[PDB]
Every structure is written in C-alpha cells, then in structure tokens.
C-alpha cells in the first residue's frame, strides 16, 4: 500500500520479500521513507521478541526433558503424590506394611489404608489391569 502510494518496493513480490526479511533476521533492499521504516520497526522488533520467546521456550522444554528420573526407591514413592501405588488386599505383603516400624513404610501404609478410592486388588491379574 504505502510504497506504491508516495521505487524499490513497487512490486508485490518486493514488498512481500521485504516483509519476509523483516520477519526473519538476515537480509535485502533498504527503504528510504519514514513510513516504510517505521512499519519495519514496528513489525521487526515484534518478531525479534517472538522468536526469542520461541528459543527460550524450546530451551525450557529441553530442560524439562532432562529432569527427574523415574522411580528407583521407596523414598521416591514417598516424595511424590501423583503416581499412586498399592499392594494385594490379602496376604503377608499387607501385613508387612501394617506391622512395619519404619516411618517411610508407615507413611506408605497410611496412604494405602486411607486411599480414595481403594488401591488394593483381589488377584494378580486385577493389579495387572490396574
């Protein structure tokens, strides 16, 4: 609009190509007008901050990708609350946690005995389905 309204950006491809160069970093044809330069200054710091945010969010997600490893201990089970866990409803396994004196396993049996809903299963295949 503005370049053909007052050249170098007389064509539609020259205007679209300078728009692409102002959307990216590098480049081609430098305007001389006040209006085209201020359109570039509005459009260009814009996409500068946007691709900076793209770089920052991609680095943030790659930082997320190398975060905390999966579970390898009962202390890892105590340290979280998202992934629930349970045992069989009858047997010496539940009697092991019920008669445990270690406060970690006591907190495990406290969570499993007060779970909503019930984490205990009837058979082994029921735990497999769970």
């Amino acid at each position: 609009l503005v370049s053909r309204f007052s050249s170098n950006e007389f064509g539609i491809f020259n205007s679209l190509w300078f728009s692409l160069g102002a959307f990216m970093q590098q480049g081609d044809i430098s305007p001389r007008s006040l209006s085209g330069r201020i359109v570039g200054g509005v459009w260009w710091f814009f996409t500068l901050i946007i691709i900076s945010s793209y770089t920052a969010n991609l680095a943030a997600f790659l930082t997320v990708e190398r975060m905390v490893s999966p579970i390898e201990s009962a202390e890892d089970l105590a340290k979280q609350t998202e992934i629930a866990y349970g045992t069989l409803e009858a047997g010496s396994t539940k009697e092991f946690f019920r008669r445990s004196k270690i406060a970690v396993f006591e907190k495990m049996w406290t969570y499993m005995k007060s779970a909503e809903p019930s984490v205990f299963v009837r058979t082994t295949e029921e735990g497999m389905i769970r």
Partner: protein
C-alpha cells in the same frame, strides 16, 4: 479493465458474506460439562438443543479493559461496519467516477477494516482462555480475500493514476 473491478467487487461481497456468517454462529467450539458451539453471542450445546447467551463479562485495570473489549464484540462488529462502508464506497466509486481520489481513501478504510478484523480475531483468540468452529476459519478466509481485494484495489488505483499521469502529458 472491468474484469478486475468485477472480481474485486465479488471478492468484497464474498468477504462481507463470510464476515456476516462469522458474526452469526459456529465461531468456536468448547466442550462443556459434552461439546458446545458458540458464535460470540450465545452458546448452544451439541438439555440438548437449548441455547442461551453465555457471553457474561463477569464470572489490574488491563484485565477489565480486555474483558470489556471481549464483551459484546466491540472490534469485529465495527470491523464489519467499516467493511460495509468500504463496500458502499466501492459501489459509489464504480459508477460515475467523478473524483479520482476517493478510491484511495476507500482502500485505506478497507485495509484498516481488515487490520481491525485481524486484531479482533487476536482478541477473541486471547480471551478463549477443545477445538475450533468453522466460522473462525471462514473469517480467516474472508480476511485473506479482503487482503487480496485490497491489493487488487490499490493496484487498479495506481494503474488509473499512472494512466491519468500519462494522459496529462
């Protein structure tokens, strides 16, 4: 000559019709507590069949200003009014072309109406905070046709200005 003007006129008419369809219904889609469509005025579920105006503006001052803009569709309604005014100006400039400078102001108003419609689309996308409706894509396509029609209108205007400058010498 007349072929490009008729193509610009039917492009402006199709853009106005798709803008009216975007105002009407099926603008967005949002799964309620089941899916439900909305057209920026009222929401309709996919019991089933009832419709009500779900554009309630309440449940810093910039949040209140953004909620006030998102309420009652201040940007796209004025954008559609400016598109209708640009279409009326193009219809008045198509027949009995007395002044050869009103087409530039009509094209400038048309480009500003397209920019305001894009800004209103950005506002409606920002106020959405799961799928999308078809009238949003229709409004986007009408924005594309409006941009192409503005390019064609300013191309015909600079061609007419170059013809007048060649005939003046």
């Amino acid at each position: 000559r007349g072929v490009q003007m008729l193509l610009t006129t039917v492009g402006a008419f199709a853009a106005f019709s798709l803008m009216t369809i975007a105002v009407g219904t099926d603008y967005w889609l949002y799964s309620r507590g089941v899916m439900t469509h909305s057209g920026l005025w009222r929401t309709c579920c996919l019991f089933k069949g009832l419709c009500k105006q779900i554009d309630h503006f309440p449940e810093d001052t910039a949040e209140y200003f953004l909620r006030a803009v998102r309420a009652s569709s201040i940007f796209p309604i004025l954008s559609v009014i400016l598109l209708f005014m640009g279409g009326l100006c193009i219809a008045a400039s198509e027949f009995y072309k007395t002044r050869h400078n009103i087409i530039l102001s009509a094209g400038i108003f048309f480009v500003s109406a397209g920019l305001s419609n894009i800004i209103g689309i950005i506002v409606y996308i920002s106020a959405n905070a799961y799928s999308y409706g078809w009238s949003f894509y229709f409004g986007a396509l009408s924005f594309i046709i409006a941009e192409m029609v503005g390019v064609l209108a300013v191309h015909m205007f600079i061609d007419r200005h170059k013809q007048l400058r060649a005939t003046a010498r």
